[PDB]
Amino acid sequence: STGSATTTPIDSLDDAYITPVQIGTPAQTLNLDFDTGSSDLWVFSSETTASEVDGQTIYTPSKSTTAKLLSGATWSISYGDGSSSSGDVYTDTVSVGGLTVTGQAVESAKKVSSSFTEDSTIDGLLGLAFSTLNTVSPTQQKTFFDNAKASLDSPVFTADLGYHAPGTYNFGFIDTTAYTGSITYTAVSTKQGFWEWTSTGYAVGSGTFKSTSIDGIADTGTTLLYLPATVVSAYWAQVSGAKSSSSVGGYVFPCSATLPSFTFGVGSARIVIPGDYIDFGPISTGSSSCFGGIQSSAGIGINIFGDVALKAAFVVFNGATTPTLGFASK
């Protein structure tokens, strides 16, 4: 089997991407944030504290003939941005882009933090990191991809995120029309539960390439590119007037600037992020200070190849026995 679903930016800045997901019988379609940096599929639901729901579409398991309470199971998750959610668990039929899993753990939120409430466009998350990170207790549950894997034509999914445009998540096949040149594959460590890999270096604009190993994670659920402070300083030094602002919470730059590109290495191959991808607009409405899309990972504890980086590439998440990551230009 295979699946193919369009993923759509939630706003004009590409702050996140939503993908329609069918849950239950008859189908209930929720728009979920596909997140290769976590491993829980959770949804706004009929169980969610009413004051914490503001415009989201909810899953109502009592209206699904295939929903079953997973008795005794609970979940609770905290994300890198400090947001969180928790609740109990149903199993139900879940389909993405034509690909159907029966008996998928659907984690129903009883509580969500303010960040989730305040974002009316995201109805939940669908985690695509390794199932070892799944938070369901006392019986850990598998991700959608792990449940689908054995039925897939090939044990892979691909992320093809758009810049200010829709893109695609495919399951079970590699669309050879969706990228240019060849795909370069690189080793993955699953020791932390992430799609963790090592970039071979970087360049700023038309500058020379710096060969240096940068360990990080391929994370579709993170907006920006978070790299070591050395790398990030080198980038923003090429933008006149750019500075790190502790009051804003990262690098800002004059909105009048033209941003240079940023290149990252994948083995001997090179992925170029155009400068426009690194512009996240005014820090507040009407401001002439703009927020940068490349930020320091110092104090996160991990480097994150988030959407800013991933949307410049066609990315293969290879879930074979020995997992690997593939990157192509497009």
Query: Which amino acid is it at 135?
Result: T
What method did the depositors use to determine the structure? X-ray
Cα(300)–Cα(281) distance, integer angstroms: 23
Q: Which pairing describes strands 225-227 and 243-245: parallel, antiparallel, or unpaired?
A: unpaired
Q: Buried b / exposed e across 252-270, counting CB within 10 Å, b at 16+?
A: bbeeeeebbbbbbbbeebb
Non-local (6+) Cβ contacts of 208 within 8 A are none
CA 148 to chain centre: 19
17-43: b or e for each residue (b if 16 or more CB lie within 10 Å)? Answer: bbbbbbbbeeebebbbbbbbbbbbbbb
| Type of residue found at 4 | S
CATH 2.40.70.10 domain extents, the chain: 5-174, 175-330
Of 51, 49, 50, 30, residue with least CA distance to 41: 30
Residue 318: which of 165, 197, 139, 137 has the closest Cα? 197
Q: Let me know if 195 is exposed, middle or buried by CB neighbors in 10 A (0-12, 13-18, 19+).
A: buried
d(C-alpha 75, C-alpha 87), whole Å: 6
Please list the active-site residues: 35, 199
CATH dotted code for 175-330: 2.40.70.10
CB 190 within 8 A of CB 7: no
> In angstroms, what is the C-alpha Rg of the chain?
20
Ramachandran category for residue 109: left, alpha or beta (phi over 0 → left; psi -120 to 50 → alpha): beta
d(CA 271, CA 283): 27
What separation in angstroms does the CA of 186 have from each of 172, 178, 193, 240, 265? 19, 19, 17, 35, 10
* Token pair in block for residue 80: 């890198």
* Experimental resolution (Å): 1.5
Q: Does domain 5-174 have CATH number 2.60.120.10?
A: no
- In the numeric block, the tokens 């970087």 are attached to 202
Rounded Cα distance, 330 and 311, in Å? 10
- Give the pair of three-digit tokens for residue 218: 């391929």
